[PDB]
Every structure is written in structure tokens, then in C-alpha cells.
Amino acid sequence: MATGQDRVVALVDMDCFFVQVEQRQNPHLRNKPCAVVQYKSWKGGGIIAVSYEARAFGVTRSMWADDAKKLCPDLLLAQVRESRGKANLTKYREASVEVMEIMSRFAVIERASIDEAYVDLTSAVQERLQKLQGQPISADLLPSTYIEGLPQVQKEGMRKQGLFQWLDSLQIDNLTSPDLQLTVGAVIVEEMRAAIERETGFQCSAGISHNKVLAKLACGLNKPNRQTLVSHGSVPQLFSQMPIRKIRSLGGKLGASVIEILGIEYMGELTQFTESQLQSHFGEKNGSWLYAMCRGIEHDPVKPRQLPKTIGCSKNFPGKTALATREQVQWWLLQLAQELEERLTKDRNDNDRVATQLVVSIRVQGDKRLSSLRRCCALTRYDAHKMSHDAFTVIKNCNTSGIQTEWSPPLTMLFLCATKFSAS
DNA sequence: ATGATGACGCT
DNA sequence: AGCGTCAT
Ligand SMILES: [Ca+2]
Ligand SMILES: [Ca+2]
Ligand SMILES: [Ca+2]
Numbered sequence: 001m002a003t004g005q006d007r008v009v010a011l012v013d014m015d016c017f018f019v020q021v022e023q024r025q026n027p028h029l030r031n032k033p034c035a036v037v038q039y040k041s042w043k044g045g046g047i048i049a050v051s052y053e054a055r056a057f058g059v060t061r062s063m064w065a066d067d068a069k070k071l072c073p074d075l076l077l078a079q080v081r082e083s084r085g086k087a088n089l090t091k092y093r094e095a096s097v098e099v100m101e102i103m104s105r106f107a108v109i110e111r112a113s114i115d116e117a118y119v120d121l122t123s124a125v126q127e128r129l130q131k132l133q134g135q136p137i138s139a140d141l142l143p144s145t146y147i148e149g150l151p152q153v154q155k156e157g158m159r160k161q162g163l164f165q166w167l168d169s170l171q172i173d174n175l176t177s178p179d180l181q182l183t184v185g186a187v188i189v190e191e192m193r194a195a196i197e198r199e200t201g202f203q204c205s206a207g208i209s210h211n212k213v214l215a216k217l218a219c220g221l222n223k224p225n226r227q228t229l230v231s232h233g234s235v236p237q238l239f240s241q242m243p244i245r246k247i248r249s250l251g252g253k254l255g256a257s258v259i260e261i262l263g264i265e266y267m268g269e270l271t272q273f274t275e276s277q278l279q280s281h282f283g284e285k286n287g288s289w290l291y292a293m294c295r296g297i298e299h300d301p302v303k304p305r306q307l308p309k310t311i312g313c314s315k316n317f318p319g320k321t322a323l324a325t326r327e328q329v330q331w332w333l334l335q336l337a338q339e340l341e342e343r344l345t346k347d348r349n350d351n352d353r354v355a356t357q358l359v360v361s362i363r364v365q366g367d368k369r370l371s372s373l374r375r376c377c378a379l380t381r382y383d384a385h386k387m388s389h390d391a392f393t394v395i396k397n398c399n400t401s402g403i404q405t406e407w408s409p410p411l412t413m414l415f416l417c418a419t420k421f422s423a424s
Numbered sequence: 425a426t427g428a429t430g431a432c433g434c435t
Numbered sequence: 436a437g438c439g440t441c442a443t
Contacts, residue, residue, distance in 0.1 A: 017443095038427060038428085039427085042425065043425080046425085046426060046427065047426090048426090048427070048428085048443095061426080061443090062426035062427080063426080064425090064426085086428085087427075087428070089428070089429085111430095112430095112431090112442090112443085113429085113430075113431095113442075113443045114429085114430095114443070115443070116443070248441090248442085249440090249441065249442085250441095251441070251442080252440060252441055252442085253439095253440070253441090254440080254441090285433085308429090308430065308431085309430080309431075310429085310430065310431080311429095311430095312428085312429060312430070313428085313429090314427080314428055314429070315427090315428080316425085316427060316428080318425045318426095318427095319425050320425095321425090359437095369438085369439080370439085370440090371437095371438075371439090373437080373438085374436085374437055374438070375436090375437080376436070376437085415428095415429090417429090417430090
């Protein structure tokens with residue numbers, strides 16, 4: 001019987017990363033309730049990142065700034081840079097590369113988003129294990145680590161108590177014990193996080209466990225600027241009252257149908273179903289994955305990949321701003337094509353690859369899906385005017401309008417994705 | 425009128 | 436190829 005303790009995997013999360021970037025640049029924003037906003041005009045701007053001081057007053061992501069200031073009147077706002085009429089996230093993409101380069105010195109990392117990376121510590125841990133002459137692990141090597149499920153009046157008091165219980169029972173004589181291995185992973189993640197902070201001023205959270213889903217769950221248990229070790233043995237207690245929708249990839253329609261088809265609420269309850277039963281309800285792939293997951297077993301690998309596989313540029317045109325003339329459809333395409341070329345040229349010189357395919361996506365008024373339609377064409381020159389002309393060429397026939405100069409039904413979204421990279 | 429992106433599965 | 440799901 002396999003237990004999914006082959007690997008040591010971590011998820012590192014830059015807590016409210018865009019806010020940290022702005023608070024490093026503007027010291028007057030540090031240790032204050034504050035948030036980062038996109039587009040000041042409509043209701044003060046849509047909030048895309050919130051410091052923990054502001055989260056205490058109820059300010060959340062996607063809330064309008066004008067509504068946020070009702071919950072939190074002293075809230076400081078930093079504004080996202082705008083280029084060619086759209087939000088430009090270049091400042092944060094650069095900072096994110098800063099952090100992942102430091103992370104790369106410690107283990108192999110998979111960029112999960114601008115602010116999160118998975119980390120495969122298996123080889124790093126094995127190496128570090130030979131280097132420790134069977135020596136004990138000091139609690140002073142784990143100054144921000146929580147041990148989930150432990151211990152069994154002061155918050156710092158609880159943490160150390162749990163950690164001392166953990167360390168006391170540790171079997172340092174067995175170089176293949178998965179609990180010892182997780183502990184060494186956790187010392188390394190402490191080291192990687194002290195270096196990120198030392199070399200960028202950014203703080204981050206982490207979770208350490210045996211796979212990606214446990215690492216991501218562990219990461220969210222103690223935030224901010226804290227890390228959590230979730231061992232294989234903590235899983236049954238942890239899953240016993242864990243809502244299904246908190247497990248990675250179960251927050252959407254699949255999760256809700258697990259809840260509804262099976263009549264359960266919590267991840268642990270999935271253990272009473274056979275793998276064939278789960279496969280018959282959710283399909284061979286989903287059932288196998290579920291069967292193992294509710295037991296803390298998951299095999300999705302940490303892909304060694306710091307660089308995205310698509311480079312894309314989108315802008316929404318909601319409400320009355322939706323595009324309705326051929327003229328303005330062509331101008332935004334041009335605006336979108338131009339920011340895309342800057343990014344592509346920076347990527348050709350920075351990462352020695354060239355993209356070869358161009359995906360144009362649009363969304364129409366009334367349709368409530370992300371994309372209404374997706375068409376592709378070749379990407380031969382990094383030239384904004386060719387790319388916009390070709391993007392337009394590829395979507396023209398969607399215009400059902402009669403008047404030449406008009407576009408119906410209005411476009412609420414324009415999207416240009418460069419993909420199918422190749423070595424250059 | 426929760427945006428701008430990104431990864432991936434299915435057919 | 437083109438659409439759907441899940442996520443930050
Ligand atoms: Ca928003
Ligand atoms: Ca944590
Ligand atoms: Ca899956």
C-alpha cells in the first residue's frame with residue numbers, strides 16, 4: 001500500500017503581492033490598511049489586492065474602492081500603471097521574476113501564478129540529509145513553522161508547543177522517514193523565505209507537505225509570513241472537517257457535484273466510496289484522483305518551469321463601453337497588439353524563444369462565458385500592425401451588422417494570446 | 425460593471 | 436482546432 005510520501009513539495013505564496021510591491025516603493029503605505037486598484041473612474045477602481053490591515057475591516061478583492069472606503073475610511077489606495085488605455089502589470093511581473101530567481105537557488109520551482117510557486121524539495125532534502133551527520137533539528141531552525149494538528153494562552157506559545165511535540169517525537173536516525181524529510185524541507189523553506197525577504201523585502205507564506213494539494217492547503221492555514229507543515233498523519237483529522245471546495249481543483253463545478261451527487265460536505269467523507277464508485281460518478285480520471293486525494297495521495301508533478309507557455313493581452317469593455325464600431329474595434333486591437341509586441345520582444349531577448357501562433361479571443365454582449373469565440377492564425381513577425389490587422393481579419397465575419405462602419409453585437413472583450421513558443 | 429492572465433482537459 | 440474548467 002502506497003502512502004504518497006515519496007516527495008517533499010511546498011507552495012510559496014507572496015501575501016497580497018501587488019500591495020507589498022507598492023509598499024516597498026512607497027514607505028508611507030507600509031503597515032497601513034491599503035489596497036491596489038485598477039481604473040479609478042468607475043466607483044473608485046476595482047480592488048485587486050488587499051493588505052491584511054485592511055482585510056480586518058472587511059475589504060476584499062474585486063470590491064470597488066468606493067465601497068471599500070465605507071468599510072475602511074483610512075484606506076490608502078495605490079493605482080496600477082496604465083499604458084495605451086489598459087492596466088499594465090509590468091511592475092509586478094518584474095518583481096515576481098525577482099523572487100522566483102532567488103527561489104531557483106534552493107530547489108526546482110513551478111511558477112503557479114504571478115504570486116505563487118510550487119517547489120519540489122525532494123532532491124534538496126536528500127542532499128541536506130547526508131550533510132547533517134544524523135544531528136538533531138533545533139526548533140531555532142524553524143522560527144515561523146506551525147505543525148498542523150499539534151499541540152494535542154499565547155499564539156506564539158501554541159506554535160512552539162506544537163513544534164516541540166513534533167521535534168521530540170522525530171526519529172532522526174531514519175534517513176528515509178517521511179516525517180523527518182518534511183521537517184528538513186521546512187528548514188529549507190524557512191531559509192528560502194529568509195532570503196526572499198532579505199534580498200527583496202517581500203514576505204511570504206508557505207505550506208510544506210508531500211504533494212501540491214496538501215502544500216497549497218497547508219499554506220492557507222497560517223497567514224501571513226508563516227509556514228505550515230502538513231504531515232501524512234495529520235490528513236484524517238484535517239480532512240474530517242475540511243469543506244470539499246477548499247481542495248485545489250474542487251472549488252468549481254466538479255466540487256459542487258461531488259457534494260450534491262454524494263451527499264457529503266467534507267473531504268474525509270470521500271474515503272467511504274470505492275474507486276469504481278467514484279469513477280462511475282465522475283469519470284475514470286476524476287474518480288481515480290478523488291480516491292487518492294481524500295487519503296492525502298496526489299501525483300501531479302512539480303513541473304520545472306519558471307516561464308509561461310502563453311503571453312496574452314486582454315481588455316474588458318463592460319456595460320456601455322462595449323465596442324460597436326469597426327473603427328474602435330481596430331484601434332483597441334492595435335493597442336492590444338502593441339503592448340503584446342513589447343512583451344514578446346522582451347521575452348525574445350530575455351528568454352531566447354520566439355512565439356509562433358496568435359490566438360484572438362472575443363466576447364459579445366449578452367454571452368456570460370469567459371470567451372465567446374477563439375480563432376488562431378500564424379505569428380511570423382513581432383509587428384503590432386500586422387498582428388492587429390490579422391487579428392481583425394480573423395474575427396471580421398463575426399460582425400453581423402449591416403452598416404459597414406458599425407459592429408454588432410457589441411464586443412465586451414478583446415484578447416490576444418501569443419503561444420506555441422520555440423527556441424531562438 | 426469583480427480584471428487581466430494563465431494552465432490544462434475534452435473532443 | 437475550438438470550447439470548457441479552474442485558478443490568482
Ligand atoms: Ca476586480
Ligand atoms: Ca501557512
Ligand atoms: Ca483532476
